[PDB]
């Protein structure tokens, strides 16, 4: 209206830098996560806010996010000083050391951009993680990300805000993991007595949701079948996961023995056969490690199943149906199920108009 206005538009570019982290760790708690976080993190928010960027489109790629690589190295660096095994077998080399039992419960960690950088964040609720996001925004720090190490099932994570989401670097390539995100957590109650409970009816629907999302991805005319792990290491074949310092290996066959869209009492609560193990394969690198025997007889751990790691079978034969089995192993997929909407960017001089 005769009042020419000059805008200073922001300019950024994809980049990589060492991020820091923030946690609600306590300097009086002697559990490993709190101990590590304390000496290795910053106090928290406490009222986080983001800068919505109107009518801006940005491209993401969860499968090539250097935020993951950094988090992975941190969780590794955590276990090194935390869970001390009695024996460590790596590369024809054998090591023996003390192995004290220690309290072990994951604490949410926020990864933050340092001075000069920023972190774009997708606000689009149903976002696959690779492609344009037409609803981004800026943040100082990510959200609370628990370093939950495990396979088959993703625990204590983040739920989809709308419908069940599935993500894969290549749905066509059958060797590729299918990270799954639930919009409704399913409780899995564990115990040192060697079993794990899961509501049957709830988990049933949970599979119908996933199935419908998969049938959609591979033609809405294919029958969706779930089957047990096709084989591998104990940490892959069973729902491997940590719970109070002890490593649990739970049979998951009763979970993944369903057939959907096919044609074609009644357990009240699926009970999974479980067992701790002193001798386990390493996720850090290649090798094995042996730990001490369990201590207290009270080992109860209740967690929320918020995600799944599946793999498809396929092949030049499977027509009219698809087969999906539990999977996982690469802990990076675990990270990518949380760090999928983020992206660190370098900030530079503004551009006039």
């Amino acid at each position: 209206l005769w009042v020419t206005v000059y805008y200073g538009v922001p300019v950024w570019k994809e980049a990589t830098t060492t991020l820091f982290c923030a946690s609600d760790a306590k300097a009086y708690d002697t559990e490993v996560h709190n101990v590590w976080a304390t000496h290795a993190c910053v106090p928290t928010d406490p009222n986080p806010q983001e800068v919505v960027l109107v009518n801006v489109t940005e491209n993401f790629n969860m499968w090539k996010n250097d935020m993951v690589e950094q988090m992975h190295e941190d969780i590794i660096s955590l276990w090194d000083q935390s869970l001390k095994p009695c024996v460590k077998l790596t590369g024809g080399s054998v090591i023996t050391q003390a192995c004290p039992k220690v309290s072990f419960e994951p604490i949410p960690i926020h990864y933050c951009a340092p001075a000069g950088f920023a972190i774009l964040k997708c606000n689009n609720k149903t976002f696959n993680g690779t492609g344009p996001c037409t609803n981004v925004s800026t943040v100082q720090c990510t959200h609370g990300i628990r370093p939950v190490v495990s396979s088959q099932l993703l625990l204590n994570g983040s739920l989809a805000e709308e419908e069940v989401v599935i993500r894969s670097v290549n749905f066509t390539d059958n060797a590729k993991t299918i990270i799954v995100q639930l919009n409704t957590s399913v409780e899995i109650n564990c115990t040192g007595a060697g079993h794990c409970n899961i509501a049957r009816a709830k988990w049933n629907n949970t599979l119908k949701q996933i199935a419908s999302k998969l049938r959609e991805q591979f033609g809405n005319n294919k029958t969706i079948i779930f089957k047990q792990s096709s084989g591998g290491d104990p940490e892959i074949v069973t729902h491997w996961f940590n719970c109070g310092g002890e490593f649990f290996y739970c049979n998951s066959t009763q979970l993944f023995n369903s057939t959907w869209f096919n044609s074609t009492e009644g357990s009240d609560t699926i009970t999974l056969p479980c067992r701790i193990k002193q001798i386990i394969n390493m996720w850090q690198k290649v090798g094995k490690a042996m730990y001490a025997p369990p201590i207290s007889g009270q080992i109860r751990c209740s967690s929320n199943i918020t995600g799944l790691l599946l793999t498809r079978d396929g092949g030049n034969s499977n027509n009219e149906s698809e087969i999906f089995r539990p999977g996982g192993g690469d802990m990076r997929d675990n990270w990518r199920s949380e760090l999928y909407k983020y992206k660190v960017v370098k900030i530079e001089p503004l551009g006039v108009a």
């Epitope: 050391q97 192995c99 193990k277 001798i279």
Partner: antibody
Amino acid sequence: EVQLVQSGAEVKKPGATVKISCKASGYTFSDFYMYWVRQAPGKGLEWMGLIDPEDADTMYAEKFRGRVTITADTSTDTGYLELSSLRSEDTAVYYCAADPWELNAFNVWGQGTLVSVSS
Amino acid sequence: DIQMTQSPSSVSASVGDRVTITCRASQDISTWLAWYQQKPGKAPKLLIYAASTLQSGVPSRFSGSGSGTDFSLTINSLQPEDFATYYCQQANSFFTFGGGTKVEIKR
């Protein structure tokens, strides 16, 4: 009730490879570790290795690595033990033990298996 | 591997006497230790597990203490059927045995 019944004495020449057994009874075999120990004539006990039958996870002492092998036929509740490249100082009694009560020590033992290796 | 070193190698004592034999790991192994008795011509007998816990059906005059690296088995009123060879043993992962300690009589 619980028991570990090994095999009989065996004679071998240097360089041979012996493989003794240890049929177990009185408990669920595949749910517990099994350990192997040998004892030279009038000398101290000497551990050799262990194994979890379920996943066949094995551990060996340094003095035997890449020369000894422990397995466990889960179907017949039997455990075996192989020793490649036998020498003259391998002449000893071989025990097998277990711990069906999980005290982390050897509670049950075998009667023993004398292995004599000479020219 | 981790070394278990027990001493003395031999010790002579009379009946009623009180005897102490010690063990020592080259690395911390907590309270995961075990003591065995073994008389000539037969298989070893579990005495103590968890360094201090007495095995069932074993005379109360037997007891072991210690934690971490330094341990010790001790017999109060020594008996005629207590003269044998005793062994300690790491029990947390590997199961290395100590050299051995022979408790013979005394005359």
